[PDB]
Amino acid sequence: APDPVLNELYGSERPAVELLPGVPLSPIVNSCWLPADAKAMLAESWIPVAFEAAAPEYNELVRRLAKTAPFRKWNELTIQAKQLEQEVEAKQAELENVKVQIADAEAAVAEVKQSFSDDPLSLTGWMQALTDLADGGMTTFEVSGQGWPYCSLRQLFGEMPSAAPPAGFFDGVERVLGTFKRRYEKERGPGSVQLMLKLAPNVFSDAWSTGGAPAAVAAVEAYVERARANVFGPDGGVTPEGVPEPLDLVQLVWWDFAAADPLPVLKALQRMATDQLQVDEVSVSEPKKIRGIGLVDFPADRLKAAIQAGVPITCVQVEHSVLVRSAQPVLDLCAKYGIKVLARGGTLGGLLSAKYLGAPPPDPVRGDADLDSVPGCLDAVNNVGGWARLQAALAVIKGIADKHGVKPETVALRWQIDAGCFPLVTTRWSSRVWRQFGYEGWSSFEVSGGRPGVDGPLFQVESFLDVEDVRALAGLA
């Protein structure tokens, strides 16, 4: 049975897949890089300070209110009341019941409309970009950002004062994605968006090296408490019963394997990802706080070592693309053990597009807003074999994208999907939206019309690639 949304949008026969029991996994995953600092983005607003015909109340407010759950329910209640009245003794009572239901749905729509004006963040540009990405059928958001090696290393590997509260590198990204998740689930019901967190402890810090394992466990526990406070808000996260709601998935980033050893951290996480039972009746003593565990860039031996230690490894993030095929053994292993692989190379941060055909290489001083990171992209260029090789390969990717009348940024994503990977693609923002896939000018409702800005042939159960397409793509690297 195909997914009730992909099949509607792109005529896809693809069935819904799950990461874990109770957690869906979209075919593409949005690695959320923020456009600004979380303190700024969380302070934006949409409410400006006889018929404007250009206000947000007539353009974005309505396109949001139409997609909600209570409004669609109210519409279907009216469309059923019509048929129930055109059908007609007891059916009059059924009609009165439907009338009560319609009045309730109407009151609920009124309240959910007032909520937009109550929350000054509901209509901002970044909330819109994330929601538009979600409605495209990609409801899995992975916490990410600019990191090693081209970040504020003093913030990454620095030493914080004692009064400083515990906060990972990606704390603001988690706050922002948590606010977005809360709003989206408020509008369209629970279980709609799936966040994949990212834990990266300062292995080289002073407290780490001085504390030993009882510190490597307290660090994990404090991080999980902080992450729950960020995602589920202050009050949420606890069911009607005392049972708390678990986080979806936590990814582990390990800086050096010879410096420190992951196993204490992994075992602590695993203890947090299982229900701790007790028997007199077998009842739960400690509810789980986590559903699964992922490993970011483990070199095919520390992964096997984590397996041999008996930890439940759900997914493995890896950099694998049409030109970067270094993490092949990790693929051959995750296949043998049945572990999902999220690939993050894809388009080389933006270098696989038409803008860079016959162009000169970017420059980190000039800047380039069409890339994730100019230094990272030049690093990728060096790992590929130069800019001449990148040009010679982008020519072939463009030829293949032309033969099938599709963007060049979808040939690469399809080559990834054909290798069993779930592509991980970087979010674009604020008039560059949907450019991650190659869709220009999609920031306006007139050019898009409310459509998703991604080519359909990506989401088909069969790959649109010819045999010669594969023969040519298998000669690039």
Binding site: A53, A54, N75, K82, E446
Partner: protein, 117 residues
């Protein structure tokens, strides 16, 4: 030697030309986008007055207010666009903003609104 340096200069000029071409394309596409958006933002009163599927005014009070509006033009000249019509309608209270919002919302549903059968 002379030919090789000429060829090198030529190729560099070609690369600069491609960068300029892509910049031109982006400028032109943004111009077209702004034009489309302005055209759309202009025809909004004509849409919510005439062609809005859930009729908020039924096109009769529309013409009644249009007549009562053109009436004042004579006292103004001796002593009309749809947006003015809507201004008068909303000011008298014939139309409320929430009605416009709900009607636009119903319209926003694609072929799945209750405009069926």
């Amino acid at each position: 030697l002379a030919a090789n340096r000429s060829t090198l200069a030529d190729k560099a000029a070609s690369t600069a030309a491609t960068v300029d071409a892509w910049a031109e394309r982006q400028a032109k596409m943004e111009a077209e986008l702004q034009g489309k958006e302005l055209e759309a933002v202009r025809r909004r009163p004509t849409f919510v007055l005439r062609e809005l599927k859930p009729a908020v005014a039924s096109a009769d009070a529309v013409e009644a207010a249009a007549a009562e509006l053109t009436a004042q033009a004579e006292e103004a000249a001796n002593a009309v666009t749809d947006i003015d019509i809507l201004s008068y309608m909303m000011d008298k209270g014939a139309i409320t903003k929430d009605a416009i919002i709900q009607a636009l919302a119903v319209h926003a549903l694609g072929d799945k609104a209750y405009t069926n059968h």
